[PDB]
Every structure is written in structure tokens, then in C-alpha cells.
Amino acid sequence: SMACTIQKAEALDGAHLMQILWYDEEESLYPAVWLRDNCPCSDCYLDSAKARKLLVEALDVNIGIKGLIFDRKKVYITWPDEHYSEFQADWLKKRCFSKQARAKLQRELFFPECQYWGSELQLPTLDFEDVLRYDEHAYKWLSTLKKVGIVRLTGASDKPGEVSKLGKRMGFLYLTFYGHTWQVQDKIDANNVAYTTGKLSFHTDYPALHHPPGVQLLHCIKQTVTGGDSEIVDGFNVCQKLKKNNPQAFQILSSTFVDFTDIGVDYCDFSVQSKHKIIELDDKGQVVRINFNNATRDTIFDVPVERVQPFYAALKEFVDLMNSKESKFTFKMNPGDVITFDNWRLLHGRRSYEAGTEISRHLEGAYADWDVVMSRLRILRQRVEN
Amino acid sequence: SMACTIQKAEALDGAHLMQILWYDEEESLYPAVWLRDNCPCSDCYLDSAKARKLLVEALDVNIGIKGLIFDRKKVYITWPDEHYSEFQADWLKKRCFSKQARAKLQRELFFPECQYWGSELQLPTLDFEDVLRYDEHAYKWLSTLKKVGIVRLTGASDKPGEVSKLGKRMGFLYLTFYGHTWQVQDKIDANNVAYTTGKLSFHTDYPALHHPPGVQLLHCIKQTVTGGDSEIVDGFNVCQKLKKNNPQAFQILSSTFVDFTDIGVDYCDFSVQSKHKIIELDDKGQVVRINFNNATRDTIFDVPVERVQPFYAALKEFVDLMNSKESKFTFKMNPGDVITFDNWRLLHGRRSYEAGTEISRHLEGAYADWDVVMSRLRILRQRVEN
Ligand SMILES: C[N+](C)(C)CCCC(=O)O
Ligand SMILES: C[N+](C)(C)CCCC(=O)O
Ligand SMILES: O=C(O)CNC(=O)C(=O)O
Ligand SMILES: O=C(O)CNC(=O)C(=O)O
Ligand SMILES: [Zn+2]
Ligand SMILES: [Zn+2]
Ligand SMILES: [Zn+2]
Ligand SMILES: [Zn+2]
Numbered sequence: 001s002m003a004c005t006i007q008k009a010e011a012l013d014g015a016h017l018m019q020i021l022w023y024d025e026e027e028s029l030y031p032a033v034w035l036r037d038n039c040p041c042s043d044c045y046l047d048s049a050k051a052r053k054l055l056v057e058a059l060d061v062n063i064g065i066k067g068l069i070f071d072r073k074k075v076y077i078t079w080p081d082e083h084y085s086e087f088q089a090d091w092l093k094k095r096c097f098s099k100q101a102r103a104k105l106q107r108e109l110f111f112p113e114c115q116y117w118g119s120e121l122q123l124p125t126l127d128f129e130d131v132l133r134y135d136e137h138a139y140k141w142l143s144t145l146k147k148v149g150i151v152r153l154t155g156a157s158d159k160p161g162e163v164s165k166l167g168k169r170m171g172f173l174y175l176t177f178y179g180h181t182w183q184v185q186d187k188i189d190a191n192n193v194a195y196t197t198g199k200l201s202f203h204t205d206y207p208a209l210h211h212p213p214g215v216q217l218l219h220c221i222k223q224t225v226t227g228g229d230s231e232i233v234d235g236f237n238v239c240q241k242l243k244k245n246n247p248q249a250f251q252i253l254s255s256t257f258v259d260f261t262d263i264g265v266d267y268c269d270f271s272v273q274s275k276h277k278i279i280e281l282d283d284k285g286q287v288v289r290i291n292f293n294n295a296t297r298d299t300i301f302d303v304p305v306e307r308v309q310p311f312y313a314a315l316k317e318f319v320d321l322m323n324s325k326e327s328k329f330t331f332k333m334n335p336g337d338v339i340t341f342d343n344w345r346l347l348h349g350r351r352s353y354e355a356g357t358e359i360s361r362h363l364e365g366a367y368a369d370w371d372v373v374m375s376r377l378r379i380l381r382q383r384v385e386n
Numbered sequence: 387s388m389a390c391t392i393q394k395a396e397a398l399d400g401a402h403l404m405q406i407l408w409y410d411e412e413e414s415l416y417p418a419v420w421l422r423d424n425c426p427c428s429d430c431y432l433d434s435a436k437a438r439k440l441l442v443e444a445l446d447v448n449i450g451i452k453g454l455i456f457d458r459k460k461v462y463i464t465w466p467d468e469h470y471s472e473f474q475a476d477w478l479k480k481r482c483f484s485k486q487a488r489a490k491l492q493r494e495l496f497f498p499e500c501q502y503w504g505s506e507l508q509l510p511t512l513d514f515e516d517v518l519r520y521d522e523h524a525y526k527w528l529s530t531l532k533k534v535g536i537v538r539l540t541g542a543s544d545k546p547g548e549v550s551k552l553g554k555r556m557g558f559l560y561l562t563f564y565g566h567t568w569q570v571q572d573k574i575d576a577n578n579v580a581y582t583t584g585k586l587s588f589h590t591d592y593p594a595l596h597h598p599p600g601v602q603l604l605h606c607i608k609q610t611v612t613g614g615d616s617e618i619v620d621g622f623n624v625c626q627k628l629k630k631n632n633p634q635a636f637q638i639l640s641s642t643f644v645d646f647t648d649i650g651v652d653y654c655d656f657s658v659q660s661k662h663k664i665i666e667l668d669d670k671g672q673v674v675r676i677n678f679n680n681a682t683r684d685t686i687f688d689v690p691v692e693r694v695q696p697f698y699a700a701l702k703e704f705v706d707l708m709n710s711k712e713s714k715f716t717f718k719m720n721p722g723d724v725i726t727f728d729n730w731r732l733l734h735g736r737r738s739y740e741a742g743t744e745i746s747r748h749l750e751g752a753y754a755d756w757d758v759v760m761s762r763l764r765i766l767r768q769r770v771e772n
Contacts, residue, residue, distance in 0.1 A: 016695065031694040038685045046582070048575045050649050051681040055587045056705040061698045097691040106688060109645075109659045171654045175558055177761075189434045196432070201441045209757050211597040259495075263436050268557045271764040272757060273495045295437040299424045302492060305483040308417040309402065312447045319442040371595050371658060375563075378657040 004093045005072045015064030018075070020092060028096040035077065036063050039085040111146050111377065116237040121329040124148055128156040128338060132169055139380040141340070142170075142373060145215070149234060149342040156219060158335040163217040163366040166340065170376050174213055174367040176206065177262070177270040184218070184363035186355055191264040193295040197355045202233060202322045202347035203293035205367070208262040208272045212291060214370030216343040220333035222362040227353030229332045233322045235290040235345050239279055242321055249314035254279040256311055259298040260291075275302070278315070289344040322347060333363070343367070390479045391458045401450030404461070406478060414482040421463065422449050425471040497532050497763065502623040507715040510534055514542040514724060518555055525766040527726070528556075528759060531601070535620060535728040542605060544721040549603040549752040552726065556762050560599055560753040562592065563648070563656040570604070570749035572741055577650040579681040583741045588619060588708045588733035589679035591753070594648040594658045598677060600756030602729040606719035608748040613739030615718045619708045621676040621731050625665055628707055635700035640665040642697055645684040646677075661688070664701070675730040708733060719749070729753070 002023040009020050011032075018030045037052075037059055039045065044054040060081075067078040075092070077085045094105060106112070124144045130137040131153060144151050156162040163181055167173035173180055178192070187195040194200065206212045243250040254277055262272040276291035301308065321327060333339070341348070353361060388409040395406050397418075404416045423438075423445055425431065430440040446467075453464040461478070463471045480491060492498070510530045516523040517539060530537050542548040549567055553559035559566055564578070573581040580586065592598045629636040640663055648658040662677035687694065707713060719725070727734070739747060 017691075029691050031691060033695050033698045034687060037698065046576065046579055046681075049578050049581075049681070050647075051579050052683060052685075053579060053584060053681070055585070056680055056702055057587065057709070059698065059702065061695065061702050091685075095686060097687075097689075097694070099690070102688050105686060109686075171563070171656070172561055175561065177557070190432065192435050193432055193437050193439060195435075198439060199441070201443065211755070211757075261436075269765060270557070270761045271768075272761050273764075274757070294442055295432075295435070295439070297438060299438075299477075300481060300491060300495075301420060301483075302488050303483075304485070305403075305415050305417060308483070309419050309447065312419045312423065312445065316442055316445065316447050323443070369597070371597075371660070375656045375658050378659075379655060382657075 004090050006070050006075070006089050009068055009070040009075050011065040011068050015066070016062075018065060018068065018077075020075075020089075022093070023072075028092065028098065028101075030092065030095075030097065032063050032065050033059065033061055035065075035085065035087065036060070036079060036083075039083070040087070041085060043083075044085075109378075111143065111374070113147050114236065115148050116240070117148065117234050117329070118237060118326050119329055121232075123152050123329070123331065124150065125152045125154055128153040128162070128336075132165060135380055135383050138169060139377070139384045142377040142380060145340055145342065145373070146377065149236075149345045150232065151340050153338040153340065154336065156336045156338050158221055160221065160364050162219045162338060163364055166217055166338065167366055167368065170368050171372045172368075174369045174372070175267075176209070176213070176367060177267050177272065179267045181364055181366040182266075184365055185359050185361060191266055192262075197227075197353050197361075199352040200348075200350045201294055202231070202319065202349045203295070204235075204290050204347055205293065205343050207276050207291040207293050208260040208274050208296050210274050210276075212289070213343050213367030215340065215368040215373050216348075216365065217338060217340045217368070218333075218363050218365045219338040220335050220363055222359065223332070223334055224353045224360040226360070227351045228361050229330055229351045230339070231328050231330050231349040231351070232341070233328045233347050235322075235347050236287055238318070238321050238327055238347075239287045239290070241327075242279075242318055245321070246314075246317050249317040250279065252307075252311055252314040253277070253318060254281050254287075256303060256307070258291075259300045259302055260293070260296050261298040261300070262296050273298070278318070290347060292347065344370070390476050392456050392461070392475050395454055395456040395461050397451040397454050401452070402448075404451060404454065404463075406461075406475075408479070409458075414478065414484065414487075416478065416481075416483065418449050418451050419445065419447055421451075421471065421473065422446070422465060422469075425469070426473070427471060429469075430471075495764075497529065497760070499533050500622065501534050502626070503534065503620050503715070504623060504712050505715055507618075509538050509715070509717065510536065511538045511540055514539040514548070514722075518551060521766055521769050524555060525763070525770045528763040528766060531726055531728065531759070532763065535622075535731045536618065537726050539724040539726065540722065542722045542724050544607055546607065546750050548605045548724060549750055552603055552724065553752055553754065556754050557758045558754075560755045560758070561653075562595070562599070562753060563653050563658065565653045567750055567752040568652075570751055571745050571747060577652055578648075583613075583739050583747075585738040586734075586736045587680055588617070588705065588735045589681070590621075590676050590733055591679065591729050593662050593677040593679050594646040594660050594682050596660050596662075598675070599729050599753030601726065601754040601759050602734075602751065603724060603726045603754070604719075604749050604751045605724040606721050606749055608745065609718070609720055610739045610746040612746070613737045614747050615716055615737045616725070617714050617716050617735040617737070618727070619714045619733050621708075621733050622673055624704070624707050624713055624733075625673045625676070627713075628665075628704055631707070632700075632703050635703040636665065638693075638697055638700040639663070639704060640667050640673075642689060642693070644677075645686045645688055646679070646682050647684040647686070648682050659684070664704070676733060678733065730756070
């Protein structure tokens with residue numbers, strides 16, 4: 001391509017930059033120290049690992065290019081200490097330091113596209129066995145999970161072991177104190193409100209951990225007619241609405257560290273404590289995670305007395321917005337359904353149902369880490385586009 | 387105790403606060419909304435789970451106490467809607483909203499005590515089998531790990547499976563793409579610079595993950611005489627020195643997102659990308675994690691061209707400080723040694739050694755999550771103090 005073909009390469013600015021003029025007349029700049037740091041030769045770079053061997057200690061941060069020649073596809077550089085490097089035009093083009101080039105590459109790496117939703121949600125749905133068997137379907141599954149925050153998979157069995165298959169399709173599941181997988185049913189001496197017939201208001205799972213599960217998988221084995229409907233909301237959409245409608249409540253919830261706790265016995269004995277801001281912003285002010293489960297919020301609340309009541313007032317505004325008919329999407333799982341969802345972004349809940357002498361309702365759940373999921377998504381995209 | 391015995395309890399400030407006068411004449415204040423939110427009765431609180439059943443939707447954020455009576459050990463409160471609550475004096479005392487009381491409780495929950503060190507480090511050392519067998523020893527192990535950032539365990543076997551035993555003693559290990567455990571030895575077509583005979587400069591493990599491993603365990607099975615010494619530094623101590631000596635370099639490294647990558651095949655096939663600030667600060671400006679492995683830092687660098695060279699200049703200052711003779715502690719692992727260390731705080735490295743026709747050097751490593759470790763520490767403290 002004219003865009004990836006070198007018309008001219010030159011050392012500039014005390015030889016501390018290389019400038020490429022592409023055949024399309026666009027220009028790109030590459031710092032000499034970055035080129036040296038990223039020399040792909042066998043001394044500097046371990047090809048079997050696609051990893052840098054060069055040490056920081058080896059890198060002269062004031063380095064300039066000693067000499068440069070080029071052809072249409074490569075640049076060949078000598079360094080002051082006689083080290084010698086070759087860089088490929090396409091590799092350079094991809095890594096161009098312009099804002100537009102860097103942003104393009106970041107989109108390709110991290111799939112940021114996000115579709116916010118409320119009660120109008122058309123629940124994305126795919127077949128379970130299709131997703132296990134076919135990369136095209138597994139790609140649609142994970143890409144949709146990332147973009148929309150939820151996908152329903154239909155046609156699974158009505159037996160345990162289905163979420164474990166999805167785990168393997170991803171890579172591996174995320175072990176917690178509740179096990180590799182866990183059974184959501186009414187239990188005697190329940191160690192968690194989940195394991196009762198009570199209503200679960202909107203929550204994220206596991207804010208008692210400093211790194212809550214990124215992705216949740218929930219498979220319906222048995223459903224009851226007496227209640228137990230599912231509800232979901234898009235936390236990122238709700239947070240946007242809250243910031244606009246009640247900036248005071250938004251500021252409180254995005255700045256106040258709330259203590260979470262979980263003590264008991266399951267996979268092993270545990271005594272877990274964390275602190276999170278309910279609305280967790282990145283350094284640019286964008287909401288990246290919601291951390292909220294009313295069951296596991298501690299009785300311990302580590303704020304001055306005068307900030308307590310305003311916190312609760314803020315929290316109520318947030319919960320009320322989540323409950324609003326424009327925000328929430330309600331549905332009922334049937335046996336063989338699996339929902340797979342972003343546990344950092346969505347909040348989820350369930351309606352109460354009636355206890356009985358045997359088990360009338362049984363879900364199997366598991367977690368996965370977003371890095372594990374994104375890894376699989378990157379691989380699938382390449383396989384499906386190749 | 388006079389300190390935990392109630393002399394007077396009273397509703398104040400439109401009945402929106404409860405004030406306790408203790409028998410020691412100290413006074414404590416408890417917001418009415420917090421008391422209501424934390425009612426311990428069976429409607430509001432699931433005792434088997436030690437979790438809140440009360441929903442935010444149930445909580446009137448403007449609530450005041452309707453009536454209150456007390457004795458030396460308890461307060462008995464009626465609410466406007468006729469709900470009724472009992473709170474224990476000791477439970478109240480622990481949760482007092484004063485800065486001193488809250489800070490005390492936070493220290494008890496999170497064990498913040500930290501002892502910084504340099505080359506003068508006296509490496510804490512305990513016996514392996516003692517730590518497996520005895521809670522007193524396992525408590526010393528984890529408390530020291532937290533405070534100092536490293537403990538050496540001696541007298542393990544020279545066979546794989548030792549770190550897995552420590553994993554079970556903690557609770558469970560943290561699975562990654564390199565496996566439940568992994569073998570540090572020279573490998574053909576190595577998928578990681580670790581699996582070669584090369585020098586590893588100071589690094590943290592796994593900044594390619596958004597949640598790097600909190601704790602690392604490394605067991606020496608076979609050691610070589612040709613090199614392979616270990617080196618460690620206290621990253622929190624180095625960061626303090628860097629901030630003082632070079633505040634510009636500190637600001638760059640604590641604000642610049644660096645891209646990390648890992649692509650290959652091990653436990654399964656993986657294509658991993660992350661972004662981290664090398665020096666990661668909490669919201670109060672305290673360093674909480676270092677994220678740095680020069681091998682896995684990407685060729686992709688997502689900053690404007692003019693910020694590139696100053697970044698490298700900053701990075702070199704940081705690495706030079708880590709290498710300084712006052713900062714680093716050097717030692718050589720023998721067969722049967724295990725080091726267990728804080729992978730968020732320490733950086734570690736190894737000297738190069740000579741390749742040969744069979745394996746002359748073999749470590750087995752594994753990871754654990756700090757929340758898993760802290761859970762065990764809390765439990766052990768209670769067992770050993772009880
Ligand atoms: C379903 N379960 C018990 C694994 C987790 C529930 C939520 C959390 O406890 O924060
Ligand atoms: C030892 N190993 C391969 C599990 C991890 C090394 C470090 C990292 O790759 O960041
Ligand atoms: O039971 C349901 O439908 C949903 N369960 C949960 O959200 C849980 O166990 O945390
Ligand atoms: O081999 C050693 O002594 C240390 N190894 C590592 O730090 C690693 O594999 O990341
Ligand atoms: Zn080179
Ligand atoms: Zn849940
Ligand atoms: Zn109550
Ligand atoms: Zn390492």
C-alpha cells in the first residue's frame with residue numbers, strides 16, 4: 001500500500017527522531033530511544049516469546065541515530081555504539097505516534113465500543129452448542145458480551161457442568177471462596193443471601209474482593225413458578241443519568257470508600273474485607289466499574305459522622321434510578337438458559353420465591369476474569385477474520 | 387469495661403443521631419440512618435451469613451429515632467414505622483465514628499504496618515514444615531509477608547509440589563496462563579524470557595494482567611553454580627527515594643500508562659494486553675503497586691511523541707535507583723528454599739547462568755491473590771490470639 005511504503009526516511013532533531021515520509025505524503029515521527037529500545041534483532045528480542053531481552057540498563061536515553069538507509073519496505077540503522085537495527089515499514093506504520101494512529105490501535109486491542117441500554121434491550125441470544133462448536137459463534141458471543149454487556153445462551157442441558165464448558169471455551173474460570181462453580185439454591189444455614197429464597201435487589205457480585213469477577217455465567221438448571229424472575233440494569237447508563245440528574249449524589253458515590261465483608265465457610269474458611277467506591281472512575285473520570293452488593297456492605301462504615309447520612313441519600317437516589325421502569329430489563333430464565341454478563345458494568349437481581357421441602361430452583365454460576373475473556377476474543381477475531 | 391458500658395444514650399439533632407456517653411465519659415455519635423440500616427434483627431439481617439437482608443429501598447434516609455431506652459449493655463430503639471431494634475454496647479463501641487476509633491478498626495482489618503528496607507535486610511526465615519503444621523508459625527509467616535514483603539521458608543523438599551502445599555495452607559493459588567504452578571527452567575522455543583538462562587533485571591511478575599498476582603511463591607528444586615543468584619528490592623522504598631531525588635521522574639512514572647503484552651501458548655493459547663502506570667498511586671497519593679517487567683512492556687507505546695524520551699529518562703532513573711548498592715539485597719537460593727513475597731511491592735531479578743545439555747536449574751513458582759492471603763491472616767490471628 002502507498003500508506004505503508006517508505007518514500008523517505010531521515011534522522012532529525014540532533015538525530016533523536018526518525019521521520020518517515022510515506023508514499024501517501026503523510027509523515028510519521030519515531031523517537032530514536034524508542035527505536036533502540038525496540039530493536040528486533042536476536043540480541044535485543046526473543047522471537048519465540050515475542051518479548052524484549054534488552055535491559056533498561058543497556059539503553060542510552062540520549063541516543064541518536066548514527067546512520068540510516070532505507071528502501072520501500074525497511075529502514076536500516078546504525079547506532080553510536082555500533083549496534084545495528086532493521087525495522088519493517090508495516091510495523092512502523094502500525095506504531096505511528098500520531099493521536100489518530102495510536103487511537104486506532106487501542107480500539108483494535110481493547111474493543112471499547114459500548115452500546116448503552118435501558119428497558120428497550122433486545123437481549124442478545126445465541127445457541128449454546130453453536131458457541132462451543134463454531135468460532136464464528138463464539139466470536140459473536142464474546143464481542144457482544146463486551147459491547148452490550150450481556151448475552152443469553154439457549155439450548156444448554158438442564159444438568160450441572162454447562163458453565164464449566166463455557167469456561168474452557170474461554171480458557172479458564174476464576175476460582176473464588178464459593179468454588180470453581182457454585183449452586184444458587186435455598187440452603188439450610190445459608191452462608192450467603194443468594195442461597196435463600198429472598199429477593200436480591202440490584203447488585204454486582206463479590207465487591208468483598210478487591211478485584212471483583214469481570215464476567216459472570218449463570219445457568220438455569222431448575223426454575224420455580226412461584227417467583228425468581230431475573231432483572232438487569234446497565235450500570236454505566238445509570239451512572240450517566242445520575243451524574244446529569246444528581247451530580248452531588250454522583251460525586252459522593254464516586255469518591256466515598258465503602259467497606260465490604262464476607263465471613264464464613266465454603267470452598268474453605270474465609271474472612272474477607274475490602275474497600276471500594278461504589279462508582280469507580282478511571283483517571284479521566286469515566287466509570288469503569290460499579291462495586292455494590294447491599295448484602296455484603298459491612299456494618300463498619302469508615303467515614304466521618306457528618307458524611308454518613310448524605311451517603312445513604314446518594315445511594316438511595318442511585319438505587320431508585322436503577323429501579324426505574326426506563327432502566328431495568330426483566331426476564332425469566334428457563335432450564336437450559338445461560339446468561340453471561342459483564343459483572344463490572346451490569347447490576348442484576350432476582351425476585352423472591354417460595355421455599356418448599358425439596359429444591360424448586362437451582363442455578364449454577366461461575367466467574368471469569370476480563371483478561372481471560374479479552375484474550376479469547378482477540379484470538380477468535382483473528383481466526384474468524386483469517 | 388468502663389469504656390464499653392453505657393452511662394447514657396439519647397436521641398439528638400431532630401432525632402437523627404444517637405449519642406452514647408460511656409462510663410469513661412467519652413461520647414460517641416451514631417447516625418439514625420446507619421443504625422436503621424444495620425438493625426441486627428432476623429428481618430434485616432441473616433445471621434447464618436452475617437449479611438444484610440434489608441434493601442436500600444426499605445431505608446428511609448431521613449429517619450429519626452422514635453424512642454430509645456437503654457441499660458449498661460444495650461440500646462433498644464423504636465422507629466417511626468414501628469420497626470424495633472436492639473444494639474449491643476460493644477458492637478457500637480467498635481464502630482464509633484470518631485477518627486481514632488475508625489482508624490484503629492482499619493488497622494485491625496488490613497494490617498497496614500510496613501517496614502521498608504534496603505541492602506541491610508535481614509531476610510525473615512522460617513521452617514517450611516513448621517509453617518504447614520503450626521498456626522503460630524503460619525501466622526508469623528503471613529504477618530511478616532505483609533509487613534516486610536518477603537519471607538524465606540527453608541527445609542522444603544527438592545521435588546515439585548511444595549508451593550502447592552503452601553497454596554492449600556493459604557486457601558488456593560491464583561491460576562494464570564502459565565498454569566496452576568510453573569517450572570522456571572531453560573526451554574527450547576521459550577514462551578517467556580523467564581524460561582531461558584538470561585539475566586532478569588528487576589521486575590514485577592505479570593503486569594500484562596490488569597490484576598497482577600499479589601503474592602509470588604518460588605521454590606528452588608535445582609540450583610546451578612554457574613550463576614542464577616536472586617536479587618530483590620523494596621519498590622515502595624525505591625519509590626519514596628525517587629519522589630525525593632527526582633520528583634519529575636516520579637510524576638512521569640506515576641501518571642503515564644504503559645502498554646504490556648504477552649502472546650503465546652502455555653496452559654492454553656493466549657493473547658494478553660494491559661495498560662498500567664509503572665508507579666500506581668491510590669487516591670491519597672500513596673504508592674500501592676509497582677507494575678513493571680521490561681520483557682513484557684509492549685513495542686506499542688501509547689503516548690504523544692514528545693513524551694516518549696522523557697519517559698525513558700524517568701524509567702532509567704528508577705532502574706538505576708533499584709540497582710544501587712543501598713537498595714538491593716542479593717542472595718542465592720538452595721534446593722529446599724522457598725521465597726514467598728509481595729509481587730505488588732518488591733521487584734525481583736536473577737543473574738544469568740550457563741546453558742547445558744540437561745537442566746542445571748529448576749524453580750517451581752505459583753501465585754496467590756492478596757485477598758486470599760489476608761483472609762488466612764485474619765483467621766490465623768484470631769486462632770493464635772484465641
Ligand atoms: C453467588 N455467590 C454466593 C457466589 C456470590 C454472591 C454475591 C456476593 O456475595 O457479593
Ligand atoms: C514466570 N512466569 C513466566 C510465570 C511469569 C514471568 C513474568 C511476566 O511474564 O510478567
Ligand atoms: O438467583 C438468581 O437469579 C441470581 N443470583 C444471584 O444474583 C447471586 O446468587 O448473587
Ligand atoms: O529464575 C529466577 O530466579 C527468577 N525467575 C523469575 O523472576 C521469573 O521467572 O519471572
Ligand atoms: Zn538489537
Ligand atoms: Zn448475583
Ligand atoms: Zn430489623
Ligand atoms: Zn519473576
